[PDB]
C-alpha cells in the first residue's frame, strides 16, 4: 500500500471525521430534545452512521474510534448512558433500545474504560438484563453484556457476581430461533472466558458452560460456532478444564468446524462482528497458539489469526501481529505437526508479508527530513530526494514551500512537475493534523467551513492567527499575510463573518367588557407560538374568583396587561384594590413578573394618571406592544421579543 | 473509429442529452397539466424525440438510455406509468395510447426492472390487454406485452399465468391485415420464449404456438418471419420440442427465409425494430449458435448475430460479442458444415475485426498518463507523446494546460500547433463529464445556460465554485479566478443572475372598526381547524378597491359575517351598494354561499330593519352563532357544524 | 421603478423616508421634489411617472383636501395621480398613521375620485423597520 | 453612535429618515421607537445615550413644548436631553 494511499486514508479520515462529527451533532440535537421519537431517530442516525463508518473501505476502524472518542469528548456517550440506565426511560423502551444500540456501536476499549471509571458498569448490566422483552432486546442485552466482558479480569469477575451467566443461558434457551442471540451469547461467553481469572473461569464452567458451548457449536450458525469454539478452546487452554470440555464433546466438533471453512470466506460474513476486534483481545488469544495447548485450540487460534490478518491487511494494520509477537507463535504452529493449524498459520504468515517503511504521523509539522524524503520518493519524485536531503527539508519547511523553492533550491525545472508536486502538497496540507500546535481547533473550524480551507491553516497559524481573531481580518490581510490569493476561498471565509450576526409562560390580564376578543386572539396565538399561556377565561370556570387566579399569576413567568379601550378607568381611585385588573397587576408587580402592557386599537391611558394607585401606576411608564389589526404580526413580534428578552 | 470520434460521440451525447432533457421537461410540463390534449401532445413530443434520438446516427443507444434514466430520475417514467394504468385515464384513451407509446420507447432493461421493483408489471400487462379497440391499440398492446417479456424468466413465467398468449393469438388472428401487429406478436413470442424456462416454454407451446409460428413465418412480412424464425428456433433449441416444430413444418421455412436475405439488407429495413436490442437478450440468443442445436437454429442465430454485429459496428459496441464470448461460438459455426450458418458466422467475424485500444471514460479527470498519451497520439501530436509521458501529465493536469505549458514544458513551439491542440482540448473540456466531482451539477447548469460554457467547469470547480455561489461572482472574479476572459461568455452567465430576480373554504366579512379582533380570532381558529380562511386584510392586489374581494367570495364555499355592533347598521339606506360589507354580502347571496352570521355578545339588529336594502335584508332572518368568549370552544364547534352542515 | 406623489406641505419627510428606506433597499423611487428645470412647469414628473412601473401616493393629513374640484389637475399631486391612472400604473396609496379616508370624497374630480376607494398600506412609525414591507408586497404583487 | 431624541408625533417621519440617512452614511443610528424592552421606559430609553457619543435632537412643532415647566423632569425628551 502506497504513501499516496496513506495520505488518501489520512485525508479521508480527517474529512469524514469532520463531516460525521457535524452529523453526529445534528443527531445529538435530536437526542437533546428529550422526546421519544427524536431520541429514537437521532440514535438511529448515529447507529446507521457508525455502521456506514464501519463499512468505509479502509479508514473504518480509525474513524469509528475517533467518533467513539468524540462521543466521550462531547459527553454524548455520557448522555446515552444516562438516557439508557434512567428509570424514566421506561416511558418508552424503544428509546433505551436505540440508546443501547448506539452504545453497542460505541463501546470501544476507551468507552468501556469510561463506563468503568464512572462506575456505570453494574447499572448498565442490570438494565441490559431488563432488556429481555423481545429477541431484539435479548440480542442487544447479550451484546452489551458481551461488550462489558471485553474489559479486564476484575470487571468480568465482578460481573459474575450478578449471575448474568444464568440470564445468558435462559436468554438463548428462550430464543434460539434467532441466530444473532446465539452469536451474542457465544460472544459473551468467549469474551468473559478470555477476560477472566482462573476462579471466575471455574465459576463460569460450574454454570454447565462446556455443555452449553457444545449446544452452541451444534447450532448451524458458523458465527455462533466460531465464538463457541473460542470459548471452549479458552477453557481447554486451562489444565484442570480439558476433561470438562472432553465431557462436553465440543473439541470433537471444533476441528471439523474449522476444516469446512476458510478464514477469508468466514471473514466476509463475520465482518459485522469483526468490527471492534482489538489488540488486547488478540494478546489474550495469542496463548491459544502455544504448543502447550490442544491441537484443537491451536487450530482455532491459527484460523482466527488468519481471519484477523485478512482484516488487518485491508485496514493496513498488520503491524499488530509483530507488536504482540504473534508472528513467532504462527511460525511455531506453521512448523508444528498440527496440519490444520499449521496451514492456517502458514496462510497467516503469507498475509503478514512485509512491514511498511514508515507509518506517517498526520502531525506532519513533526516530520523529519527522512520522512520528507520518504514522502517525496513515494509520490514519484525520487530524482529530487537527494536534493531535499541536501537542503535538509523538514515537515515545517514542506508546509512553507512555493514553486520558487522548487524551481531554485530543488532545481525542479518542469512547471508541470511543479504543478503535480504542488497538487500532492496541497492534498497533504489538507490532510494533515495541526492539533499538535493549534490550540483553538482553527483547523477543525476551517474544515467545518469547507475542507479545502485546511490548506491555509498552517500558514495563518504560523503567522499567529487564531480562531478568535478571524473576524478582524481584512481581505488584504487574508490575501497577503495569510496567502489566500483565491478570492473564492476568501469569499467563503468572509461568509463566516457575514453570518456572525443574530409551568406557565404567560398570564393575560384584560378588561372583560372590551379586551375579550383580543386577549383571546393573543392567548390562542401565543399557544400557537408554543407558550404555556393562560387568560381569565382559561382559569375561572365553575368556581369563585379565588386566590387560584393569583397562583396562576405567581406560576407565570410573564404577565400581559391588555391596555384596552376603557380598561384602566376603573383603576382610578381604586386604593382599596377592589378592581381585579388591579389585584392581577399588583400581584404581577409583587412577584416581579416580566410585565407586558399592550396598547390596544382604541386604548388610551387616563388623563388623571395621579389617581391610579401608587402600587400599579408604574404601568403607565412601562415598555409595551403597539396593537394594530392589520399590523398584528409586528405587534405580536413586539410581544414575543419582550417574552424572549 | 478514432479517438476524435470517441470525443465527438461523447460531446454529441452530452450536448444532445442536455438539449433533449430540457425538451423532455417542456413535454413533461404539458403532461403535468393533467389535461387530455396536453398529455397527448407532451407524450407525442417525447415519442418523436425518442425516435429522433434512436435515428441519431451514432450516439442513439446511449442517448436513449440516458434519457430513459433521466425519465426515472425525474419520476417522469413513474408519472407515465400511473397516467397509463390509472382508471381515470378512461376519460381519454388517447392519453393512455400516447403514454403507452412513450413507455414502449422507454422500456430499457432498467425501466423494466423499475416496473418489476414497483410491482406495476401485472397492472401494465392487464391495461395493455385492455388496449384492444383498434389495430393501433392492438399493436401497442403486443409491443408493451413483448417488452415486459424482455425481463428475466420468473417475470415471463408469472405473466404466462395471465393467459395473455391466447389474447396475443386472438389479437393477430383479428388483425393480420396489419404487418406491425404480426411483428409485435412474433416479437412477443420470440421475447417470451427467449426469456422463459422449460416449463413456461411448454405452457406457451400448448397454446399451439409452433403452428402459430408456422402461420407467422408464412406471412409475407420479413420482420414477422425473422421473429417467427427466432421464436421457433428458440423452441427447436430444446430437446423435447424439435418434433413439435417439425409437426408445425416451420423449420422448412427457416433456411429458405434466410437464403433470400443478407443480414445487412435485412438490418436496413429492420432497424426501426432493432433499436433497443440488448446484451442479455444476445446472451440468451448465443446458445442457438451451439453445435448441439439444429442447422436451422444455428443459421438463424448466425444471421441474427451478423445483423447485431452490423448495428454494434455503427454504435461502436462490437466489444459486446467478446464480453459474452459469442466470438468463440461464431468461430465454431464458421468452422461447422452448416454452410449457411457458417457463411453468416464468417461474415459476423468479418464485421468483428479488432478491439479499441482504450474506451476513454468521459470522467476525464480520472485519466492516467497512459490515457493522455493515447489521446495526444490520436489527435495527431504523436511526436510530443514522449514529452507528455516525461512530464507525467494526467487527467487533472490536462485540464489546467495553458499555451505556456505547451510552449515551455512540452517545448511546443508552433503557435498554430498550439491553437490546434487547444481547440481539441476545449472540445474535450466541453465533452467531459464532471459528475465524478461536481456535487452541485454546475456542469449541467452551465450546459443548460449554453453548452460551450462547459469549458470553464473544471477551472471554476477546482477553484471551489459551486452552483449556489454563482449569484455572488463579480465580473472580475469570473474573468480572473475562473479565467473566463471572453466577455461574451461572461455576459451570458451574467444574464442568468441578471434575470434571477423577481380556492377558499371560508371568507370572513366584518366591520373593520368593530369586528377586527373577532374576525381575526375566527380566521385563526378556522385555520387551526384546517380551513383555508381568507379576510379583507389580505387578498387584494394593489389596484383600486375592486372585484378581487368578491372573486374571493365567489371562490369561497362558505361566507362568515362577523355580525359585530355597527356592521349591518352601516348598510342602512345603502341602496346604492356603496358599503363594502354590502358588496360582500350581496355577492354571497348572489352566488348562494353558505352564509353564517356570528353575533358578537353586544350585537343587536338595528331598530330600522326596513332600511336595510332588500337584496341583503334577509341577513336579519339568518342562522348564526352567538359568539361567547367564555364558550369559544363550543361557539367554534357550532360554526364548524354550520360549515359542515 | 416607483414615483412618489406626496403633499409638499405635509408628506415631505415620509415620501423621502420611503424613497430612502428604498435607498437602504435599492429602488429607483422618484419624488415630486428635484425634477423640474428652468421651465413654465417642467412636469418632468409626468414623464418619470410614465417611465415608472409603480406609483406610490403618500396620504398624510391634509393630503387630498386641495384635490377637491381640481378637475384641471392644477394641483400637481392631481396631475401626477391622473397620469398614473391614465398609464395604468400599479398604484399604492400609503395612508399615514393619522390619515382618514376623507368625507367629501365625491368632490374629488372624476378621473381621480377612485383614490379614496383604493387599496393602500396604512403606516406606523413605531415599527417603521417593518411597516415598509407591505409597500414592497404591493409593488411586487 | 448617534442617538435621536424627538417629540414622537412630529420628529416622526423626519426622525426616522435621519436614522435611515445616517445608517446610509455608515453611523449606527437608533431611535426611541427601537430601544424599549421588557421593563420600565427610562431604563431602556436612556442607556443608548450614554453609549452613544453623538446626540441629535429633532426640533419640531412639539419638540421643546412638553419640556416647558417640566421641573420634575417627567418629559422623556427632557430625560434624554438632560
UniProtKB/Swiss-Prot annotation, chains A, B:
Superkingdom to which the source organism belongs: Eukaryota
GO molecular function: identical protein binding; NAD+ nucleosidase activity; NAD+ nucleosidase activity, cyclic ADP-ribose generating; protein kinase binding; signaling adaptor activity; small GTPase binding
Domain TIR: 503-599
UniProt-annotated location(s): Cytoplasm
Keyword NAD: yes
Tissue and organ expression note: Highly expressed in hypodermis. Localizes to postsynaptic regions of axons.
Phenotype seen when the gene is deleted: RNAi-mediated knockdown results in reduced survival and reduced pmk-1 phosphorylation in response to the heavy metal arsenite.
Binding annotation for NAD(+): 511-512
Gene Ontology cellular-component annotations: axon; axon cytoplasm; cell body; cytoplasm; dendrite
Gene Ontology biological process terms in this record: antibacterial innate immune response; cell fate specification; cell-cell signaling; defense response to bacterium; defense response to fungus; defense response to Gram-negative bacterium; NAD catabolic process; negative regulation of gene expression
Transcription is among the record's keywords: no
Keywords of this entry: Cytoplasm, Developmental protein, Differentiation, Hydrolase, Immunity, Innate immunity, NAD, Neurogenesis, Repeat
EC number: 3.2.2.6
Annotated SAM domain residues: 367-431, 437-502
Catalyses which reaction(s): NAD(+) + H2O = ADP-D-ribose + nicotinamide + H(+)
Active site as annotated: 584
Role according to the record: NAD(+) hydrolase, which plays a key role in non-apoptotic cell death by regulating NAD(+) metabolism. In response to stress, homooligomerizes and catalyzes cleavage of NAD(+) into ADP-D-ribose (ADPR) and nicotinamide; NAD(+) cleavage promoting non-apoptotic neuronal cell death. In males, involved in non-apoptotic death of the linker cell which guides gonad elongation during larval development. Required for both innate immune response and specification of AWC(OFF) neuron.
Family: Belongs to the SARM1 family.
Subunit details: Homodimer. Interacts with rab-1, pal-1 and unc-43.
Domain characteristics, as noted in the entry: The SAM domains mediate the localization to postsynaptic regions of neurons. The TIR domain mediates NAD(+) hydrolase (NADase) activity. Self-association of TIR domains is required for NADase activity.
Annotated protein name in UniProt: NAD(+) hydrolase tir-1
Natural source organism: Caenorhabditis elegans
Gene designation per UniProt: tir-1
First and last residues shown, out of full length: 248 to 903 of 981
UniProtKB/Swiss-Prot annotation, chain D:
Domain of life per record: Eukaryota
Subunit-level organization: Homodimer. Interacts with rab-1, pal-1 and unc-43.
UniProt free text on domains: The SAM domains mediate the localization to postsynaptic regions of neurons.
Organism, as annotated: Caenorhabditis elegans
Tissue-by-tissue expression: Highly expressed in hypodermis. Localizes to postsynaptic regions of axons.
Function: NAD(+) hydrolase, which plays a key role in non-apoptotic cell death by regulating NAD(+) metabolism. In response to stress, homooligomerizes and catalyzes cleavage of NAD(+) into ADP-D-ribose (ADPR) and nicotinamide; NAD(+) cleavage promoting non-apoptotic neuronal cell death. In males, involved in non-apoptotic death of the linker cell which guides gonad elongation during larval development. Required for both innate immune response and specification of AWC(OFF) neuron.
Compartments (UniProt record): Cytoplasm
Domain TIR per the UniProt entry, residue ranges: 1-82
Family, per entry: Belongs to the SARM1 family.
Disruption phenotype: RNAi-mediated knockdown results in reduced survival and reduced pmk-1 phosphorylation in response to the heavy metal arsenite.
Active-site annotation: 80
Binding sites annotated in the UniProt record for NAD(+): 7-8
Name of the protein: NAD(+) hydrolase tir-1
Gene name tied to this protein: tir-1
